[PDB]
Amino acid sequence: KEMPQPKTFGELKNLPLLNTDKPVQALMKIADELGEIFKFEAPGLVTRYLSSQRLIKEACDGSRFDKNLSQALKFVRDIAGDGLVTSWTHEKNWKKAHNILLPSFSQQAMKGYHAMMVDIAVQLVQKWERLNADEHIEVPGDMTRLTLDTIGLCGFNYRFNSFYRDQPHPFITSMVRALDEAMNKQQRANPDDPACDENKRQFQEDIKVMNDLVDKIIADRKASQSDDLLTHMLNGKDPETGEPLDDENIRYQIITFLIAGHVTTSGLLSFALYFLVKNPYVLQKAAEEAARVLVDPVPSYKQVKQLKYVGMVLNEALRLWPTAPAFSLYAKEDTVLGGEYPLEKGDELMVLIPQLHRDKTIWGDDVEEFRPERFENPSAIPQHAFKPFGNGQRACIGQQFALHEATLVLSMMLKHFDFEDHTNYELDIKETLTLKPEGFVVKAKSKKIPLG
Ligand SMILES: C=CC1=C(C)c2cc3[nH]c(cc4nc(cc5[nH]c(cc1n2)c(C)c5C=C)C(C)=C4CCC(=O)O)c(CCC(=O)O)c3C
Ligand SMILES: [Fe+2]
CA–CA separation, 247 and 393 (whole Å)? 25
CA–CA separation, 443 and 291 (whole Å)? 20
343: helix, strand or coil: strand
Task: Tell me the CA–centroid distance for residue 153 and ligand 1, in Å.
Answer: 18
Find all residues with CB under 8 Å of 411, minimum gap 6, and list them: 286, 289, 290, 293, 294, 299, 304, 307, 310
Determine whether 264 is an active site residue. yes
DSSP E strands: which ranges in 162-216?
none
Task: Tell me the CA–centroid distance for residue 262 and ligand 2, in Å.
Answer: 9
- Residue 144 CB burial class (10 angstroms; 0-12, 13-18, ≥19): buried
What is the position in ligand 1's atom list of the atom closest to the CA of 105?
Answer: 26
Please, are residues 443 and 137 in contact by the beta-carbon 8 Å criterion? yes
Ligand 1-lining residues (CB < 6 angstroms):
67, 84-85, 98, 151, 256-257, 260-261, 264-265, 268, 322-324, 327, 388-390, 394, 396-398, 401-402
Please, are residues 290 and 415 in contact by the beta-carbon 8 Å criterion? yes
Write the residue with the smallest CA distance to atom 38 of ligand 1. 327
Task: Tell me the CA–centroid distance for residue 447 and ligand 2, in Å.
Answer: 34
DSSP 244: B
Q: Method of determination?
A: X-ray
Q: Which member of 38, 275, 386, 389 is catalytic?
A: 389
Write the residue with the smallest CA distance to atom 12 of ligand 1. 396
Write the residue with the smallest CA distance to atom 23 of ligand 1. 261
CA–CA separation, 276 and 136 (whole Å)? 17
Q: Which residues are annotated as a binding site?
A: 49, 396
- Tell me how crowded residue 385 is: count the other CB atoms within 10 A of its CB: 16
347: helix, strand or coil: coil
Greatest Cα pair distance in the chain: 65
Please, are residues 412 and 128 in contact by the beta-carbon 8 Å criterion? no
What is the position in ligand 1's atom list of the atom closest to the CA of 402?
Answer: 23
Write the residue with the smallest CA distance to atom 36 of ligand 1. 390
Residue ranges of the alpha helices (H) in 81-169?
92-101, 107-129, 139-156
- Please name which ligand lies nearest the alpha carbon of 255: 1
Determine whether 389 is an active site residue. yes
Q: Which member of 40, 396, 401, 432 is catalytic?
A: 396
- Please name which ligand lies nearest the alpha carbon of 262: 1
Judging by DSSP bridges, how do beta strands 441-446 and 137-138 pair with one another? antiparallel
Mutate to test the pocket of ligand 1, among 396, 397, 403, 435 (most ligand atoms within 8 A of CB): 396
Q: Return the H-helix or E-strand segment holding 352.
A: strand 348-352
> Virtual CA dihedral for 157, 400, 117, 244, nearest 10 degrees?
-10
Domain 1-452 grouped into CATH 1.10.1040.50: no
Find all residues with CB under 8 Å of 430, minimum gap 6, and list them: 21, 436, 437, 438
- Residue 296 CB burial class (10 angstroms; 0-12, 13-18, ≥19): exposed
Determine whether 203 is an active site residue. no
Which of 44, 72, 67, 45 is CA-nearest to residue 432? Answer: 72
Please, are residues 425 and 439 in contact by the beta-carbon 8 Å criterion? yes
Task: Tell me the CA–centroid distance for residue 268 and ligand 2, in Å.
Answer: 12
Task: Tell me the CA–centroid distance for residue 331 and ligand 2, in Å.
Answer: 23
